[PDB]
RNA sequence: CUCCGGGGAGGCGGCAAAUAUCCUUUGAUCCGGAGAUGUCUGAAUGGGGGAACCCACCUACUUUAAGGUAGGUAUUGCAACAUGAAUACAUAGUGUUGCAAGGCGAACGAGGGGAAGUGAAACAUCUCAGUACCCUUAGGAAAAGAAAUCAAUUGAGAUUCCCUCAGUAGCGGCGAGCGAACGGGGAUCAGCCCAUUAAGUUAUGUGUGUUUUAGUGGAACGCUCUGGGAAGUGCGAACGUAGAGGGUGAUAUUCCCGUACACGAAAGGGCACACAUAAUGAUGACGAGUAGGGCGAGGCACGUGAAACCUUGUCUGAAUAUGGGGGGACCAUCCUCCAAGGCUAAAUACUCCUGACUGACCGAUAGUGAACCAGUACCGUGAGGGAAAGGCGAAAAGAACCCCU
RNA sequence: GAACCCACUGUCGUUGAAAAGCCAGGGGAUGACUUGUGGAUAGGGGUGAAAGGCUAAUCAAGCCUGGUGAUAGCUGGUUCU
RNA sequence: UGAGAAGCAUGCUGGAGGUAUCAGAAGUGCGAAUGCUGACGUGAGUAACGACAAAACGGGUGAAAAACCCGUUCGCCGAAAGACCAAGGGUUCCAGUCCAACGUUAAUCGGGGCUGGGUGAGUCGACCCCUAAGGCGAGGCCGAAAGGCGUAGUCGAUGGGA
């Protein structure tokens, strides 16, 4: 129901385009979001997460089980 | 102070000043005294109840501040105070302190 | 000649009625403004 | 149909030329009744409180009049009338 | 008459309520026909019904 | 409607008089507290719907006919229990019960988005301005808060608000404009913890104190003149811990209501302090995808500038007390602090509302749009716009009766 | 060629009977036809057998409320001796 | 009376407030702004009285009759100027009584004022069962928020059902 990373909470942010004549117009920066299936061995199933590449790096560093447990602690249905 | 329906009062202001009588009613701050402050009412006939009309004389109310309770002993205007004689509140004449004569 | 107002009670109620106003947040804001102003009749 | 509602169904008789003619000729009673009363309720109330037999009931509702009194406008309430037909010669 | 009413049972009070409701209907019919000169009668019946219902609520 | 308390002779609310039936010293009307009842619509929640309507289902009792009485039946979230696919174990799914939430409403707070008219005597950087407006969501306040902060004699010592510093230093088509800090003087003052866990806060109960919701008593003036009427003239008198105010037929300390002062509460509510028990603080144990860096933006008085510092959309990425951050490019030396975990009162902001008091504020074209049956009449499909209209007399004593019509 | 749907000509009307009409003539009238009821498309948008036409008697950017007391080197006015 | 803005005295009306002097503060002075609100003039007793289907007389009532009632004639419509239904309106329907205002004149008349009556259903219509276009929409998909769309369903006649 939004462009929100499940792991980091990243979401689009506002900013400006700045031309060579210094004209400023509003823009947004969007996160590098995508869907990814991760094998969960303790539950014998694939979990599909909407996350950023930075969230993927976090999962790489901390293990899928710890991240999933943390999201469940924050109150997400995984 | 207090003036009730049965009392005997004396008029202290208005065209009836000096006259005395018995009050007939008290309502809000207006009092009617028997035989005082008479007006002439031109009454039209009341068709449904007959009652052929005429010029009738009746009493008009005076402001309660324009009458004073009459002291029977001295035949003079007085004021009214309150005293708990024995265990009951009663009215008393300010000038003398005796109780107020009942109607 | 035909004039602009051609009355129809069903269309009147379905366009400007109480439930139509309550169905959206802007209509509820309309009702709030009319209550704040103290209108004797809120809707058609 | 309880006694409390039975005692509330009927309001009063109707006094008019039409009601008087109906009573004098066709043996029909004209009543003012509760705005929410039904035909079954009216029949039960009449049979209980008058000891007569009812063959059929006709009802009609007259909307109240809006009139201006003084400087203010007002409206009278709706009235429901019951035409109660009694069996053979009764009441 | 609430003091007199309070010295009765629930079952007596319910019968009293039924009697008073029937009496109220009879008074309304008499007034509608125009045979009644005293409307304080219907006022008293109304207030008595209210008192009986209050006492029933208190006692139950 | 009931009960408790007050009060003591009238009363059946107002326009709005009259009339009847009446009620009341066996204590009415009225005033305060506590209870009972409380139709339908509306978050509206049994389903639906053009708001105030249409149609239902399930239990228990009741009736004999075609009904009644009472209770239950919304959605979502959490917990427990039960049941249960592809698919073997499971999981998803399904149901019941219990608890909770939704809506409305002034301003103030916090956060998510965010203009243009205008000024620059044109206009694009800039200004207007993080203003107007839209959205989400608290509390009696909120936010912030206990230095990886400043300072530069080696000193200060958490936040917040006010006066100065100062229109100074700076920023800026170096234009128009924007505009600090250090230091000093005040208001208020307060610190406490990271798993055996603190200060504090919130509930319930008890006790104490105070306050609040009816009320009672409450001093003292006569004569005379003018007058329709005296409170006004003239002559004397009395009270004052009371000469605030209002009314009474014209201008009253002493006529009335009051005022100073002295008292007063069955019953209920508010606040303060002290104990009791819960619960919270409090999934957190010294902080890694973190600090720092490359690219693009935003915030800082500071527009890329000699540009430090803070935030991060994207790509990366340490050391870890012989360690690390800052002191406005940067290096060395000195000084100072310990980020990547938390809680915390006051001084501060506001007025839909309650009580008391006040005004060199208005007096019916003024003052609220509205002193009056006004957000009404009226206009518009609708959002919406939006008036005019106060005064007989002290008292109706509001003109019996006669005449023309 | 009637009903029905249109609007080519002329007189009248122009503080009208009428904020677009009457009268006398005129065109289509089984079709790309006329029409009731109920719906959909919303403002730099819609719809348009295309005239910048129409979008509630308003259209080269509808109406209402706010920014707002916009700005106006322009015009007017500015009260006793 | 003074040089002026103005001052002073007094007759009549009016019926309860006014205020020296010296200081102090301003919603402090109007003829104009095609200024704003209310009242009232001129035009002027002038134009007009809304389809050129058309009226005449006798009697009645009445303060008053061209317009109301009764009667005898005349004329106009008759694919509507007659009779119905839906939509829309809401008491305008009927009777008695009244004539100020309303009715483009008067009115005894009225769709006007006041008072009292009047709408009777198993078969007519609605409600109800059913669905179209379209609307809403448990879960769901999407979106900074507000929200967009949509499945199962659930509504919705202008149509089907004694
Ligand atoms: N979604 C965004 C998409 C981005 C897209 N990829 C475009 C892109 O990649 N980069 C955009 C640039 C972003 C930057 N913040 C804009 C900025 O800082 N401007 C500065 C403007 C200064 C002043 N106000 C006017 C001025 O003097 N201007 C000049 C010049 O007029 C302009 O000439 C045009 N204009 O005609 C250009 C020559 O061409 O040089 C400008 N001067 C300069 N230019 C340089 C620059 O940018 N940096 C380094 C330095 O050299 C800069 N000085
Ligand atoms: C915020 N971030 C996320 C969050 O925590 N809560 C809100 C989640 C909203 C989110 N957009 C997803 C969603 O469910 N959207 C629906 C949707 O817009 C629409 O439904 C259909 N069918 O079109 C609408 C109809 O009313 O209802 C919304 N849902 C609603 N849930 C609400 C409720 O219960 N009360 C108040 C009101 O917010 C209600 N609306």
């Amino acid at each position: 129901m939004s462009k929100v990373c499940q792991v980091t909470g990243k979401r689009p942010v506002v900013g400006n385009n700045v031309s060579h004549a210094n004209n400023k117009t509003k823009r947004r920066f969007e996160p590098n979001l995508h869907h990814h299936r991760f094998w969960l061995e303790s539950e014998k199933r694939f979990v599909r997460l909407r996350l950023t590449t930075k969230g993927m790096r976090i999962i790489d560093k901390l293990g899928i089980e710890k991240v999933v447990a943390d999201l469940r602690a924050q109150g997400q249905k995984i | 102070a207090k003036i009730k329906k049965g009392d005997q009062v004396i008029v202290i202001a208005g065209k009836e000043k000096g006259k005395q009588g018995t009050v007939l009613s008290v309502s809000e701050d207006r009092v009617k005294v028997e035989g005082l402050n008479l007006v002439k009412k031109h009454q039209k006939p009341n068709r449904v109840t007959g009652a052929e009309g005429g010029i009738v004389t009746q009493e008009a109310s005076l402001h309660i501040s324009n009458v004073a309770i009459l002291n029977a002993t001295t035949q003079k205007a007085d004021r009214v105070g309150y005293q708990v004689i024995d265990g009951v509140k009663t009215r008393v004449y300010k000038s003398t302190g005796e109780s107020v004569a009942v109607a | 000649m035909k004039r602009t107002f051609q009355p129809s009670e069903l269309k009147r109620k379905r366009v400007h009625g109480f439930r139509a106003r309550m169905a959206t947040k802007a209509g509820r804001q309309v009702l709030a403004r009319r209550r704040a102003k103290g209108r004797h009749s809120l809707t058609v | 149909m309880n006694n409390e509602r039975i005692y509330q169904v009927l309001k009063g008789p109707v006094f008019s030329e039409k009601a008087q003619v109906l009573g004098d000729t066709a043996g029909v009673q004209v009543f003012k009744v509760d705005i929410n009363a039904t035909k079954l309720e009216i029949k039960k109330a009449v049979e209980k409180l008058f000891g007569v037999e009812v063959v059929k009931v006709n009802t009609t509702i007259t909307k109240g009049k809006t009139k201006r009194f003084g400087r203010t406008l007002g409206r009278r309430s709706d009235v429901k009338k019951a035409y109660v037909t009694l069996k053979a010669g009764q009441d | 008459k609430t003091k007199d009413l309070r010295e009765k049972s629930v079952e007596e009070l319910k019968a009293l309520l039924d009697e008073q409701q029937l009496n109220q209907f009879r008074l309304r019919m008499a007034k509608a026909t125009g045979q009644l000169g005293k409307s304080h009668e219907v006022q008293v019946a109304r207030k008595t019904i209210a008192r009986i219902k209050t006492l029933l609520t208190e006692k139950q």
Side-chain angles (χ1 to χ4, degrees):
Chain A
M1 62 93 99
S2 288
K3 273 165 146 123
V4 179
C5 176
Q6 286 185 252
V7 175
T8 73
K10 275 177 182 267
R11 64 161 73 240
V13 292
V14 301
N16 291 311
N17 302 293
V18 190
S19 94
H20 282 287
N22 253 292
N23 313 103
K24 291 184 179 40
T25 47
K26 290 285 199 177
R27 59 165 299 182
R28 336 203 293 165
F29 294 83
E30 289 182 356
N32 200 2
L33 259 192
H34 63 270
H35 287 97
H36 205 306
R37 296 160 53 246
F38 286 96
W39 181 245
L40 197 39
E41 175 59 13
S42 87
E43 298 205 47
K44 288 318 181 103
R45 58 205 205 74
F46 285 98
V47 293
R48 200 169 181 250
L49 301 158
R50 203 179 182 180
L51 82 182
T52 50
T53 55
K54 183 198 177 136
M56 278 168 42
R57 285 175 90 237
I58 290 167
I59 289 175
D60 277 13
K61 156 179 187 152
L62 300 183
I64 177 75
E65 58 304 314
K66 180 142 191 353
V67 182
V68 166
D70 291 3
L71 315 169
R72 299 193 149 142
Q74 312 174 9
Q76 292 190 42
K77 273 70 207 284
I78 316 301
Chain B
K2 209 55 172 62
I3 296 207
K4 308 171 74 270
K5 166 169 182 184
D7 298 327
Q8 186 86 13
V9 297
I10 175 156
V11 180
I12 65 174
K15 68 148 153 223
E16 305 286 51
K17 177 185 195 192
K19 306 195 193 166
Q20 80 187 37
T22 299
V23 3
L24 299 157
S25 36
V26 187
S27 184
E28 286 307 80
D29 305 313
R30 311 206 61 81
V31 66
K32 283 195 207 176
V33 184
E34 193 199 290
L36 304 190
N37 203 234
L38 299 172
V39 298
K40 300 197 143 52
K41 179 96 217 281
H42 304 78
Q43 216 153 75
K44 29 210 74 190
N46 189 286
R47 286 275 50 102
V48 293
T49 82
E52 153 78 336
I55 307 166
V56 285
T57 323
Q58 55 205 23
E59 277 113 332
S61 74
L62 309 140
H63 198 267
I64 198 158
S65 93
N66 283 355
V67 298
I69 173 168
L70 178 80
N71 188 325
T73 297
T74 79
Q75 293 298 331
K76 272 185 185 177
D78 213 329
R79 317 200 280 285
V80 159
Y82 286 109
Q83 255 180 225
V84 186
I85 190 176
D86 300 44
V88 71
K89 194 159 53 178
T90 67
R91 287 189 295 165
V92 282
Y93 300 104
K94 289 285 246 275
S95 59
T96 89
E98 319 260 47
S99 280
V100 160
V102 186
Chain C
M1 316 140 72
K2 178 147 50 144
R3 300 304 179 185
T4 56
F5 185 59
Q6 305 295 332
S8 154
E9 193 56 38
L10 178 62
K11 275 145 69 61
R12 183 167 182 80
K13 299 282 216 203
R14 281 174 177 181
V15 177
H16 310 292
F18 182 86
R19 303 182 54 84
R21 297 273 190 239
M22 291 289 294
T24 67
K25 72 110 191 152
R28 291 190 299 267
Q29 268 149 8
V30 172
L31 293 180
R33 291 198 303 266
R34 291 182 72 85
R35 280 191 181 109
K37 208 189 185 180
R39 292 278 189 183
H40 285 198
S41 99
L42 275 191
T43 60
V44 295
Chain D
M1 174 103 252
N2 62 39
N3 275 334
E4 178 155 284
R5 182 57 174 152
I6 291 170
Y7 298 153
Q8 273 165 36
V9 165
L10 308 172
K11 289 174 120 82
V14 175
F15 292 127
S16 88
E17 169 163 310
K18 193 190 182 176
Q20 183 255 351
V21 169
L22 278 172
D24 283 346
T25 63
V28 181
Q29 309 300 294
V30 190
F31 284 102
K32 269 165 212 147
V33 300
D34 199 64
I35 197 50
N36 295 323
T38 81
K39 294 186 178 174
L40 192 61
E41 280 182 311
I42 295 161
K43 177 209 248 243
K44 269 193 234 292
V46 169
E47 294 190 314
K48 211 190 155 333
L49 310 159
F50 293 111
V52 296
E53 286 140 287
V54 171
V55 326
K56 76 171 169 194
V57 184
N58 299 52
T59 51
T60 195
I61 300 173
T62 294
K63 269 52 90 198
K65 275 165 181 178
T66 301
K67 300 227 150 173
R68 162 175 290 282
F69 317 73
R71 69 180 279 254
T72 198
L73 273 145
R75 180 185 200 271
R76 275 138 157 200
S77 288
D78 297 347
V79 172
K80 187 189 258 189
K81 273 187 324 205
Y83 288 110
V84 185
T85 299
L86 300 182
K87 197 214 271 203
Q90 281 167 76
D91 200 324
Chain E
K1 47 188 322 291
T2 165
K3 52 149 154 264
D4 326 303
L5 279 173
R6 196 181 270 102
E7 308 153 6
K8 263 167 262 193
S9 158
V10 165
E11 286 316 346
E12 313 173 281
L13 281 183
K14 299 181 132 144
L16 258 160
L17 188 66
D18 213 84
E19 292 191 2
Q20 288 297 309
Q21 276 164 355
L22 174 54
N23 171 43
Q24 175 176 64
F25 162 81
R26 296 282 173 208
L27 286 179
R28 189 201 308 131
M29 217 60 27
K31 169 168 185 211
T33 299
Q35 311 159 345
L36 189 80
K38 316 151 100 62
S39 33
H40 71 101
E41 298 218 14
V42 317
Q43 303 177 12
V44 172
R46 181 190 186 81
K47 288 231 181 173
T48 334
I49 283 142
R51 293 206 240 265
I52 295 173
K53 284 202 189 222
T54 321
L55 285 211
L56 274 183
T57 308
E58 292 191 29
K59 274 182 217 253
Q60 282 177 252

